[PDB]
Amino acid sequence: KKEKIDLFYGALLHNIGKVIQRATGERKKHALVGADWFDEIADNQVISDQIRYHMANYQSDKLDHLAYITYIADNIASGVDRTYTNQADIFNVFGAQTDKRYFKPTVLNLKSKPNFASATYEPFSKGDYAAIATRIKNELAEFEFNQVQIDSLLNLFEATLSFVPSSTNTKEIADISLADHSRLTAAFALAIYDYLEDKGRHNYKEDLFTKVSAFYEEEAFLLASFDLSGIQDFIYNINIATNGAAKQLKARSLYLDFMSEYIADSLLDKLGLNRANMLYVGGGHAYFVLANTEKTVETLVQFEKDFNQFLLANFQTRLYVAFGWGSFAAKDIMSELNSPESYRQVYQKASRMISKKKISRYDYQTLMLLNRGGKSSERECEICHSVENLVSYHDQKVCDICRGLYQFSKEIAHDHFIITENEGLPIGPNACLKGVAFEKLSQEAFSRVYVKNDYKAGTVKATHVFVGDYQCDEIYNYAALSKNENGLGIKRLAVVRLDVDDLGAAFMAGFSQQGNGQYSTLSRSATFSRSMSLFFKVYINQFASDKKLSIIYAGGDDVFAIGSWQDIIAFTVELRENFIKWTNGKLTLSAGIGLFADKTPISLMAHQTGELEEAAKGNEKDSISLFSSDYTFKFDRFITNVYDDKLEQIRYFFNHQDERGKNFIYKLIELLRNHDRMNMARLAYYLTRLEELTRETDRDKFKTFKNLFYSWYTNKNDKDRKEAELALLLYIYEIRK
Amino acid sequence: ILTDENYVDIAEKAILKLERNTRNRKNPDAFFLTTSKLRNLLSLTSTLFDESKVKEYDALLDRIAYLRVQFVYQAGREIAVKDLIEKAQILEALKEIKDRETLQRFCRYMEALVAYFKFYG
Amino acid sequence: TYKLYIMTFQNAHFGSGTLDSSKLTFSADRIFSALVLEALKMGKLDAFLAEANQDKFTLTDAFPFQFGPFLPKPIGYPKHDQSVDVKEVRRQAKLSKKLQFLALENVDDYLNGELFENEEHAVIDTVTKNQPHKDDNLYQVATTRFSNDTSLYVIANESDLLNELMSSLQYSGLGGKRSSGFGRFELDIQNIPLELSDRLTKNHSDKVMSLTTALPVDADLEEAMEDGHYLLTKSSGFAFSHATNENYRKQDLYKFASGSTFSKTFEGQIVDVRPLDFPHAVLNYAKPLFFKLEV
Amino acid sequence: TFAKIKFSAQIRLETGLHIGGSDAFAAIGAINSPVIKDPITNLPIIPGSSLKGKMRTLLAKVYNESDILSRLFGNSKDKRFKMGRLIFRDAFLSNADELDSLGVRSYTEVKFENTIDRITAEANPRQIERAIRNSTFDFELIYEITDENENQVEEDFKVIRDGLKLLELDYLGGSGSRGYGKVAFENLKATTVFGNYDVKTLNELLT
Numbered sequence A: 001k002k003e004k005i006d007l008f009y010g011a012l013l014h015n016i017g018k019v020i021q022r023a024t025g026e027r028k029k030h031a032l033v034g035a036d037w038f039d040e041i042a043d044n045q046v047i048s049d050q051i052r053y054h055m056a057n058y059q060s061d062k063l064d065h066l067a068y069i070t071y072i073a074d075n076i077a078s079g080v081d082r083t084y085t086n087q088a089d090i091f092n093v094f095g096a097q098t099d100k101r102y103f104k105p106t107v108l109n110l111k112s113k114p115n116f117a118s119a120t121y122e123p124f125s126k127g128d129y130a131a132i133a134t135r136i137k138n139e140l141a142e143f144e145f146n147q148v149q150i151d152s153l154l155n156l157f158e159a160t161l162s163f164v165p166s167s168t169n170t171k172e173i174a175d176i177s178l179a180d181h182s183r184l185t186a187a188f189a190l191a192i193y194d195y196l197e198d199k200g201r202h203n204y205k206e207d208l209f210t211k212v213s214a215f216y217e218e219e220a221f222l223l224a225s226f227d228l229s230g231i232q233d234f235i236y237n238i239n240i241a242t243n244g245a246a247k248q249l250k251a252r253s254l255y256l257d258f259m260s261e262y263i264a265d266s267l268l269d270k271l272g273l274n275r276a277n278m279l280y281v282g283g284g285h286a287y288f289v290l291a292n293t294e295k296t297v298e299t300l301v302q303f304e305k306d307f308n309q310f311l312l313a314n315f316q317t318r319l320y321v322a323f324g325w326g327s328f329a330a331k332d333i334m335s336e337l338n339s340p341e342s343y344r345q346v347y348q349k350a351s352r353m354i355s356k357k358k359i360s361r362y363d364y365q366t367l368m369l370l371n372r373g374g375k376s377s378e379r380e381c382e383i384c385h386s387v388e389n390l391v392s393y394h395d396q397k398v399c400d401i402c403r404g405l406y407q408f409s410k411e412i413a414h415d416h417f418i419i420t421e422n423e424g425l426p427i428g429p430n431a432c433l434k435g436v437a438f439e440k441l442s443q444e445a446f447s448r449v450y451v452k453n454d455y456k457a458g459t460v461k462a463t464h465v466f467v468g469d470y471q472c473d474e475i476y477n478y479a480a481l482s483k484n485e486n487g488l489g490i491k492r493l494a495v496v497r498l499d500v501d502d503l504g505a506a507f508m509a510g511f512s513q514q515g516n517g518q519y520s521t522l523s524r525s526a527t528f529s530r531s532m533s534l535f536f537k538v539y540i541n542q543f544a545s546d547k548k549l550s551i552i553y554a555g556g557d558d559v560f561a562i563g564s565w566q567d568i569i570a571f572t573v574e575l576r577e578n579f580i581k582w583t584n585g586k587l588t589l590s591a592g593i594g595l596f597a598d599k600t601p602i603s604l605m606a607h608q609t610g611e612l613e614e615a616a617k618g619n620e621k622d623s624i625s626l627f628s629s630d631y632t633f634k635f636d637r638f639i640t641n642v643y644d645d646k647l648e649q650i651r652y653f654f655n656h657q658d659e660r661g662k663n664f665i666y667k668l669i670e671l672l673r674n675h676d677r678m679n680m681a682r683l684a685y686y687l688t689r690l691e692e693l694t695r696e697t698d699r700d701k702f703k704t705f706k707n708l709f710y711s712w713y714t715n716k717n718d719k720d721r722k723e724a725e726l727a728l729l730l731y732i733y734e735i736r737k
Numbered sequence B: 001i002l003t004d005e006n007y008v009d010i011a012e013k014a015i016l017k018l019e020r021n022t023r024n025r026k027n028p029d030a031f032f033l034t035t036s037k038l039r040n041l042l043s044l045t046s047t048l049f050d051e052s053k054v055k056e057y058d059a060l061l062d063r064i065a066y067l068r069v070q071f072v073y074q075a076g077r078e079i080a081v082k083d084l085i086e087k088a089q090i091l092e093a094l095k096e097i098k099d100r101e102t103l104q105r106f107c108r109y110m111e112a113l114v115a116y117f118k119f120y121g
Numbered sequence C: 001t002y003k004l005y006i007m008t009f010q011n012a013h014f015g016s017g018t019l020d021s022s023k024l025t026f027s028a029d030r031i032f033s034a035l036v037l038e039a040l041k042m043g044k045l046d047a048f049l050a051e052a053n054q055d056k057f058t059l060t061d062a063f064p065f066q067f068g069p070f071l072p073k074p075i076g077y078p079k080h081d082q083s084v085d086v087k088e089v090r091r092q093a094k095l096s097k098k099l100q101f102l103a104l105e106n107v108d109d110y111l112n113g114e115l116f117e118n119e120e121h122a123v124i125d126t127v128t129k130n131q132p133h134k135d136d137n138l139y140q141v142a143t144t145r146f147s148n149d150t151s152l153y154v155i156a157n158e159s160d161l162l163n164e165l166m167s168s169l170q171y172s173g174l175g176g177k178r179s180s181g182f183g184r185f186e187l188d189i190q191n192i193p194l195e196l197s198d199r200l201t202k203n204h205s206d207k208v209m210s211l212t213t214a215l216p217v218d219a220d221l222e223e224a225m226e227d228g229h230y231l232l233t234k235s236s237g238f239a240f241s242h243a244t245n246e247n248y249r250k251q252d253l254y255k256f257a258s259g260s261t262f263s264k265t266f267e268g269q270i271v272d273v274r275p276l277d278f279p280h281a282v283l284n285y286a287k288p289l290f291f292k293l294e295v
Numbered sequence D: 001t002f003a004k005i006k007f008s009a010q011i012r013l014e015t016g017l018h019i020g021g022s023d024a025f026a027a028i029g030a031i032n033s034p035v036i037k038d039p040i041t042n043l044p045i046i047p048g049s050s051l052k053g054k055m056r057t058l059l060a061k062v063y064n065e066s067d068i069l070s071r072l073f074g075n076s077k078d079k080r081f082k083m084g085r086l087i088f089r090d091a092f093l094s095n096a097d098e099l100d101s102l103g104v105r106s107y108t109e110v111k112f113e114n115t116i117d118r119i120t121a122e123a124n125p126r127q128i129e130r131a132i133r134n135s136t137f138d139f140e141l142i143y144e145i146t147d148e149n150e151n152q153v154e155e156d157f158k159v160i161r162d163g164l165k166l167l168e169l170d171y172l173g174g175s176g177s178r179g180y181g182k183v184a185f186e187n188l189k190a191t192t193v194f195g196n197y198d199v200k201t202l203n204e205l206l207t
């Protein structure tokens, strides 16, 4: 803005003396450790004097001073009201009373493994804090405090300080990282200023320091939101005989990710705000903290009208943004502020406004001009059935938006994406999105540049989005990649669609089970917001490091990943066994894998996988659905029984022999599939014939196989038998010549 | 008598209820009944279990009458088969055919006797 | 207003923009455009079109008939009347988000608040047809396949010219790939229950629910946006004509939807959505037959 | 005058059928080609488009070079003949009770079948599922009499008669050169519902 450079950086770079006092172990009070440190790094006393007095209790009367705002916004961004432990797990207070877990404090990278908590990190890993603090000092030196570089500083915290706790001498705030706590405190502290500079006050010591309990009751914050509607009608507009099948499917789910990104980053500079206020962004849904005044509400209503005119001019009611705001006082604090109906129940008030506006979509003057007619069109866009601006891209007649999506699918491999003015694939009013190389930023004229899966600072001063993406090969080669070095593998490619089970039920309510409700704060759900986006948007490429697959989309709860079938099955086993260690077993997910032949269309492929996901949601909730709706196993007996226990023992038999070939395996599948009471006897006869038919050296190997196979045939609980069928499908598929 | 939901568990119990060679401890707990005397009984029923599929029941009732001949006759020769038709209630079940679906239920009942006999020793 | 026209399909393809999709019901505009395409080839359209511009006659889209006429789900009419067990009541708002049909026996309990776990009408198949030995020859056709007792019942004016037309739609079929085995039905004109014809109003100024897609007249569209809770659904497609030798496009009438709750129920149109420089009209029937909620 | 006469026949399968469709999952032992079925009853169906395209390609070899196929099956161009006057319906397997009285396990037999390489001499087994012999399906065929028509109505009747003799000389299914066809139309009667058109003299053209 025009003065908020003094307020935003000072309310963000305060408590960074809590890093150096953490690093080298000084005995000085932490309010001064970042105060003096700023002097040998930069020189701006107005930002500095907030950090000199952000504690506001060692010397409350020294210097109308904006550190008054930094004090109250530190209390409210903290879930509590304010001795050397690490950052605790967020899932220590999620759900049930389980073991305590603590993060190992590290930085982030594009090649770093997921840093899981454990019970062995109660001590204080002091040595990494030297490596953290020198990473700060190398990039805070050559740096300028402006709206150009208002955004590179946030990733400097969200990568490095992402696991460092805050105020470790405590009993409650054990899991609020300093990257998140500085992000929320700078988010609130701007919103007090936009709440106070609109009312007309200039002094900050009588409505903040003395009327704090009045401000604890004063409704001074909106919780804005939006909801991008019609996403799956836009993404899954693929059909059989689509000329670009998978590239358009990977482009449109990325297109609406940038559009959901640009609805955020264009509403915040229409206001006087920035990316600290955005508490979350996901698949269309995103949550803000804005100022509670008429100068910002009328900006929201105007921008909702102005942005829907953009969507209507390019999509014709396929997409619709729906705002909603809930005014709230300081009631998202665990200090018994009407604990049942206060925290979610004003986060729900903005959610009811979205439902009121998703149901009363347009108004008079738009719908009078929607169906004005006067258009003798002849050919339609054969993808999205639109009419205007038809071009002839590779002898099909497509529209103007779907033309750029083929161009955006060619520009998708780049690392940088810019907001041009008139350069194709529009995502806003006077805003178009373009893929661009690194040094082409000198050439092209832009307004904001988005960089994808990156943590380097660079010269672009960009905005760091995180889109999950991987390709080990082209999509049409994944069938022929399913061989081994021998040649033994079935030429199939599998598609998995994962989904976290009850994600909004774990986001919104989530933490109220432990305690009396003293963990139902904003900062827990803001840390839960990051940790579910930090997993699926960043860590999923580590799980797909060398696997022969292609993550088409991973965002929010949902993963959609085509690939070779040995690795896709290995992917989700490796994903969940990481994801249950990431969350201590809570937030179980569900998956559905489907084998498909070579050269089948992706719309036939992506649909039936969706049939298996919605079938696996209805097992009870927590299941994998291999290949077909009738292999719906729990994950808690698919990895520990099918994929690693039963398939290991079948593979241990059929490699230490040359006698029992595939014909023995195939006649077992008929016996496992029909399963009347008569086939129990016929199986007991079939194994006992071959027990003496074999050569008498390896008769114990067959007898320790057959009496162990007959054991899980007659169990009469069905949970030990259908697994044996699925274990033998995964063995013949691995030995298919 | 034997229904569809029990005739294999009946035949599982009948092999266990059948006696064993308690003496002659050279691979002991072996049966007095032998495999080849048992497969002579199933060779009667297995050629009706596949002509029940093809033909009517109205033509098979001449050989279904003959199964009471030879299950008695094989029981009269060796005392081991004599115990089989007592333990496994075969002469009771053979007089209760009356249609195709019990003929196939009895002929699957004889296969259940051969299956568990091969299984248990 | 008058007798409901029960129609038993057992195979039907209903639109929704694409060919890979098939909606359960078909709405007022389609069945009316079937009648005009029927009354033309009887040489009898001008007796129907002179009737088609009267206050006397009504018309209603399809709803499932499972031993009793059903109704749409009111759009947002149930109120938020319970901050307990958020883990599962959000899952309850998942199954009660694709329901869209309520029985008349208990539609008053829905406004009063009741869960009503949805029953099944016509599980939609998607069979992949072809054309042999051609270039680009794999289309895919969805199919509503009805559940052994479910019929559809347009609710219209009991008119003898209307019954002569809709006894011939038994043999021309509604919906999609008719002349390929879809949409052929058998009509059975029944009578209305007494507590349903009690509330088949058209001009009752109260908290009133629509039972068909209706584009209001422009004097009424201003005030109907205020308290209404509607869907919009984009009626469009190609105009069928025997007089073009060229497949043109309708002019994209954005209507309301059946189930749109409203106040001071408005009067609709017959919206000439003909393309530019086109011989005849494309009627695109849109006028409401409402449903009172509390009365 | 206006009329809609229909051709009610009982079709009959002297060999199997195989009308496939969506291919879900092979599952090793499971059927490599499941026949199309009625997804409520799980009885084998004959879809009407599988009749409608089959009897027009047969008549394309007879009446080709058009004009008499266009009015009986439609054409996307040619404004005279969109929705061309024949409205078929899917077959419904009438005798789901008469087959059970004959004694039958399920209505759809499974045929095992393979493929032998010319040099390796190694097999490659199918499981082509069929719908069994002498099942009867409900066959109905709405031909429409109109004001434009009754000049050529008699000459359409000498085509649909001939367009059902050819299905008795071709297969109407999938994999027809390997059997799986040989369908026969019996009790082929031409009733008139919703109309006034004398269907007497047509009924002797059918037999």
Ligand SMILES: Nc1ncnc2c1ncn2[C@@H]1O[C@H](COP(=O)(O)OP(=O)(O)OP(=O)(O)O)[C@@H](O)[C@H]1O
Residues within 6 Å of the ligand: A227, A228, A229, A230, A231, A232, A235, A253, A256, A257, A282, A283, A284, A553, A555, A557, A558, C097
């Ligand atoms: N950008 C995206 N990419 C892929 N999947 C998405 C995306 N956004 C949403 N989804 C998936 O679609 C589902 C719902 O999307 P939808 O467009 O229906 O949201 P909505 O309109 O807000 O739904 P509702 O009206 O029920 O609140 C989510 O559960 C999510 O898994």
Ligand SMILES: Nc1ncnc2c1ncn2[C@@H]1O[C@H](COP(=O)(O)OP(=O)(O)OP(=O)(O)O)[C@@H](O)[C@H]1O
Residues within 6 Å of the ligand: A280, A281, A282, A283, A285, A499, A500, A501, A502, A503, A504, A505, A506, A507, A529, A532, A533, A555, A556, A557
């Ligand atoms: N990244 C995210 N973080 C938190 N919540 C999310 C995210 N993405 C989507 N959601 C939530 O998901 C809800 C939609 O349900 P969704 O199917 O997406 O997950 P869910 O609530 O766990 O339900 P399900 O068990 O059916 O997946 C929305 O209310 C939205 O708040």
Ligand SMILES: [Mg+2]
Residues within 6 Å of the ligand: A499, A500, A501, A502, A503, A504, A557
């Ligand atoms: Mg989810």
Ligand SMILES: [Mg+2]
Residues within 6 Å of the ligand: A499, A557, A558
């Ligand atoms: Mg979801």
Ligand SMILES: [Zn+2]
Residues within 6 Å of the ligand: A381, A382, A383, A384, A385, A386, A398, A399, A400, A401, A402, A403
């Ligand atoms: Zn398009």
